[PDB]
Amino acid sequence: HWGYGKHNGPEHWHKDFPIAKGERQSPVDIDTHTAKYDPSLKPLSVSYDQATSLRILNNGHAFNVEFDDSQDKAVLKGGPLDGTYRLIQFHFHWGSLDGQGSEHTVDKKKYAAELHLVHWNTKYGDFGKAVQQPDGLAVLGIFLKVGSAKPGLQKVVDVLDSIKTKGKSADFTNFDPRGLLPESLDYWTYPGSLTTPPLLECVTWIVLKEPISVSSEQVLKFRKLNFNGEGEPEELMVDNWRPAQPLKNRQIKASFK
Numbered sequence: 366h367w368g369y370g371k372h373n374g375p376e377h378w379h380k381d382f383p384i385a386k387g388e389r390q391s392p393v394d395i396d397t398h399t400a401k402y403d404p405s406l407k408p409l410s411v412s413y414d415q416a417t418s419l420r421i422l423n424n425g426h427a428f429n430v431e432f433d434d435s436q437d438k439a440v441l442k443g444g445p446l447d448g449t450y451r452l453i454q455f456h457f458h459w460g461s462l463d464g465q466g467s468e469h470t471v472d473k474k475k476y477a478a479e480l481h482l483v484h485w486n487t488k489y490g491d492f493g494k495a496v497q498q499p500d501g502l503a504v505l506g507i508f509l510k511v512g513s514a515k516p517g518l519q520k521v522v523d524v525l526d527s528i529k530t531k532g533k534s535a536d537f538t539n540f541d542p543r544g545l546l547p548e549s550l551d552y553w554t555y556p557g558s559l560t561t562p563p564l565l566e567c568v569t570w571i572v573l574k575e576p577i578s579v580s581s582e583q584v585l586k587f588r589k590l591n592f593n594g595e596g597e598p599e600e601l602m603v604d605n606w607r608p609a610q611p612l613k614n615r616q617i618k619a620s621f622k
């Protein structure tokens with residue numbers, strides 16, 4: 366099946382998922398000199414005080430910190446969004462080197478990693494139905510640069526030893542995702558897609574302008590995970606990012622001047 370290697374990577378995905386060459390694919394390069402400030406965009410509303418994390422899973426492509434999305438406990442609203450979107454999970458995409466790893470780029474700059482907090486539109490009832498709609502998901506993307514450690518990320522880094530391989534999961538309760546946010550909520554937004562198969566064009570992307578900083582030791586631990594399952598040849602989980610796709614007929618809007 367699909368992956369990130371030379372024979373099953375992003376350049377091959379279109380054979381099984383033709384929408385890979387679609388009109389609103391993600392990620393994209395964010396050209397800061399052409400994004401337009403939109404004074405009508407509202408401040409984002411991130412309400413994570415009642416967030417309930419449950420588990421962390423290595424799914425063979427990344428690791429997902431899953432939340433209870435059976436109630437409106439952790440929701441995203443406002444910004445370019447109409448309605449309420451519930452947090453279902455967050456994960457990261459990262460590189461083999463600090464100079465690459467993010468999916469979105471800013472003026473062609475690649476960050477060491479990118480965090481995606483995935484939310485689905487409650488008007489569709491469940492994640493599976495939401496991904497079949499143009500406004501089904503809202504993903505909050507946050508860039509990671511290497512420098513000072515991010516205290517709020519350490520609990521995630523420390524549990525990785527227990528989910529080293531594909532299919533492994535571990536209890537991960539009481540994790541506060543607010544500890545992964547930068548100070549500012551200024552953002553860019555554009556209509557896009559899932560960045561891994563099925564690549565459905567169901568995402569309102571909201572990418573924060575301010576990166577968070579993580580330490581080299583923290584990212585190094587992400588690179589010790591495995592794409593493979595236990596007992597299989599070790600293939601380090603690194604460079605699990607899709608490169609920038611054609612913007613085509615889309616405009617990226619900025620919430621700030």
Ligand SMILES: O=C(O)CN1C(=O)c2ccccc2S1(=O)=O
Pocket residue numbers: 481482483504558559560561562563564
């Ligand atoms: O990478 C992303 O932020 C968005 N996602 C995807 O691209 C994707 C693909 C398959 C299943 C689930 C997901 S997702 O919602 O996590």
Ligand SMILES: [Zn+2]
Pocket residue numbers: 456457458481560
């Ligand atoms: Zn992602």
